[PDB]
Paper text:
Incubation of RgGH98 crystals with BgAtri produced a complex with clear electron density for the BgAtri in the binding pocket near Glu 411. RgGH98 makes hydrogen bond interactions with each of the 3 sugar residues present in BgAtri (GalNAcα1-3(Fucα1–2)Gal-): Tyr 289, His 330, and Thr 371 with Fuc; Lys513 with Gal; and Gln 305, Asn 332, and Lys 788 with GalNAc, respectively. No large movements in side chain positions were observed upon ligand binding. The difference between BgA and BgB is the presence of terminal GalNAc and Gal at the nonreducing end of A and B antigens, respectively. Lys 788, present on an extension from the C-term domain, forms part of a hydrogen bonding network with the GalNAc N-acetyl moiety and a ring hydroxyl, forming a stable structure. However, unique to RgGH98, Gln 305 and Trp 528 provide additional interactions, bringing the terminal GalNAc into a location conducive to hydrogen bond with Lys 788. In concert, these residues are proposed, to provide the observed BgA>BgB specificity. Gln 305, Trp 528, and the GalNAc binding site are unique to RgGH98 as compared to Sp3GH98, Sp4GH98, EabC, Cpe0329, and BACOVA_03433. Additional calcium and magnesium ions were modelled in the RgGH98–BgAtri complex and RgGH98 apo crystal structures. However, in these experiments both ions were present at a concentration of 50 mM, increasing the likelihood of nonspecific binding.
Residue numbers in the entry: 49 to 893
Write the structure that this text describes.
Amino acid sequence: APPLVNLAEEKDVKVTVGENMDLKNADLLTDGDKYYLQHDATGNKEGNNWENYQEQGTEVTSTAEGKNGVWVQVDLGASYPLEVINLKRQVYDGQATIGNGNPSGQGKRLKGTKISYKNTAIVIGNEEDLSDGQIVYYEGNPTLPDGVKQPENVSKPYEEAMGGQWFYMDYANKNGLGATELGTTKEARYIRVYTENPKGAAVKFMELGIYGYENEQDVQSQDGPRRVIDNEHPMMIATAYSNDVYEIGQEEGPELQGSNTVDGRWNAIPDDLKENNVLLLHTNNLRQFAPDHIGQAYLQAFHEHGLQIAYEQGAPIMLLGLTAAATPENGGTQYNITADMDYGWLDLMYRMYPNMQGVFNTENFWAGIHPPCEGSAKMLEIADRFGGFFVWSDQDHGSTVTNIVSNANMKKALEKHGDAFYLIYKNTSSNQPDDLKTSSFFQGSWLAGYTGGWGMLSDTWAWDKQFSKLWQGAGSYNNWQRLCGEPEALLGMQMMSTYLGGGVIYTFEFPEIVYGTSNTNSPANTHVLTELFRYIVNHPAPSKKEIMEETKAVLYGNVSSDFYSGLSGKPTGFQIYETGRYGIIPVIPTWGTRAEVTKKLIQEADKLGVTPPNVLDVKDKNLSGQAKQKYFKDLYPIEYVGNAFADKWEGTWYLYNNKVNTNEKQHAILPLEGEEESARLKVEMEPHEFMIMNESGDGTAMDITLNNYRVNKDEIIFDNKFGLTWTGDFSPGQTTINGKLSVYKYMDEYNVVNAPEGKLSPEDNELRTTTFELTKLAKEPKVQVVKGQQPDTDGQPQYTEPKVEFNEETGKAVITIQTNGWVDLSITGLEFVYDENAQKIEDEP
Ligand SMILES: CC(=O)N[C@H]1[C@@H](O[C@H]2[C@@H](O)[C@@H](CO)O[C@@H](O)[C@@H]2O[C@@H]2O[C@@H](C)[C@@H](O)[C@@H](O)[C@@H]2O)O[C@H](CO)[C@H](O)[C@@H]1O
Ligand SMILES: [Ca+2]
Ligand SMILES: [Ca+2]
Ligand SMILES: [Ca+2]
Ligand SMILES: [Mg+2]
């Protein structure tokens, strides 16, 4: 257990009241329950109806005539450093009803009249009569203990809330309501709460949480950030979705999609990569549409439970803070139990769990604009106060970033806390060609210093919108089938392109396919993600300085989707390029006027010691399409010839075949280093392959890593040879739809890395050819596999031994290999001589 605890709950406390007061059911004050839900075992429903909100609690009643004010006091049994207090009293005058929310007819919200209590005060101390009392909070005019002085600044009443009220130990910080620095404590044994009900002599106290430490040695402090996210410290996020089943008080940790667990996902990660990974707790459709009491209870219980399990395993955590515009801010939806977030609870999670790091937001604007901005503004402030971070994932059709800045509170929060805020793409709607513009916006936002970084969320839902079987269009298959169809190597190609643009966050869905099921690692995870991510961890991406230095043009405004065609590549929806010649092309959205953005970018460049790029409005005559190619070709020299993607960056060539789902070979012809400048490497690749090449520099050697890992889904998924049920319906006794269960069955039984007996190795044994032509050489070069992807349990090879043909009379050496997966090749004994016929590395006339 972490050092910050609810002492009121953990200790054997004594509860008392003043003379002429009656005390009833004292144990309810410190039972950890603020909601008194009764039907947890049946999904918080009795029949088809959500259970009512029924408020129970410790009742204190004045029996002194004409004097309704009461107090209740807790003796913790010893003096402890206290940091936070949470007080909740009866919220509703009478009983609240369950009425219509947002969206109308599905969302549910409590309705009724809320109580605003008066003459509320909180006093703590180390004498039982509190003659040494210190004021934590004071509203109205309750008579304090003898020896405790009236405070100068007095609070006014507030409306009681579902989560209660939160108090901290700095009276000068908003009269005790203002959240303090981690570890701001006062030592006390006795805690007294004063309250007067506006109607009558009785107050029901539903909970008094008193959070502190066992001793002063355990008191925490804010000594720096919880993590660094940058080119030298990249971060992979894996989403841990609730399976939508949970019961408050259950012994076992929350079940995740695909028979996964929080601890299980963490322990599946290779040890050397754990420091660059985080788990995102996502509530998914847990208690979806539920009214306030059920929503808040389940949001809190699910996240706390995940945090605790993570804490025991040493796993850092992000929480889903906001999706589907489901926020407690005015106008919010109830599409998710994030609707019932209590910002006091979110603060508590950072104080209680040292492994709590970040907040995640995605997919809001289809459902509402300003509510998710208002909520994100508050959560960004909280995250950054604790040295944490905030990630916002979305595709930008053109108004995503401008919507964010159009909200005054979010704009202001970004100005103060922007260094802890990260924008990552999300290519779910792959059929809209906004992938490349999104990356440009997000890179541009970072480059100019409005945000702390950028990155990627690649979603296999992208495949659903366009394709099915290999080389085929969507056809008439179920969407859960098409979800499974994406080539594994393509995920690596996407990672490579994000890396080259100085991206620092990497995340993938559908998690049960890309990371795995049943706490195992999937084929994608094992043979692509973990391999390439290890390269990214050990070979830092370009810094902001390096991006700035290589960038000759920055655009301003809402760049056209189709701008990239005939430049870096046609937007495919899959976040890949035809060439690396121009980089990502940073486009700064309208964070301010062109002049304001220009000044900001110049300041950022100056700070890095770099020449500022020129800023052009997207509408500039030079970017028209006739003149755009001329303008960009004059700024950025050609590096290689051919139709494959290639980028040379700091001595290393990065390549891929850039066809998403068309079976075409592509090539790249590279000028090689050394004394002989006519030296050439031609690479030819079939689709779904990426490559990293490093020359020795003296023209004698080179190392090549290639990866073209692709599982064939044609028979198992699309022909459906095992007769799985791919539909959106529930089957008898199931809380998960058939389509999902089928994905899980595929991953558990039919596509298993190192498949044990009775399970199938992945369908990955059909190999494809990569060829390398080296010219002009005097003698045959030497090739060998340093390391290669090993067989699954079926014994079938993932590569064949490389073959070298060398022609004496011409310079040409041809190296051929067949792979499905990764190999590290080493080529040595290269003796280049002058080649008058060497391919010219230049543009066409
Ligand atoms: C009902 C259901 O099973 N949903 C799962 C599914 O949800 C995603 C798909 O519906 C997809 C179709 O193209 O659209 C996505 O927006 C949707 O994502 C989910 O909902 C949005 C609002 C966000 O909260 C996302 O974080 C969330 O994933 O697939 C996801 C995983 O891709 C989950 O399993 C859902 O349970
Ligand atoms: Ca209680
Ligand atoms: Ca380059
Ligand atoms: Ca080198
Ligand atoms: Mg195999």
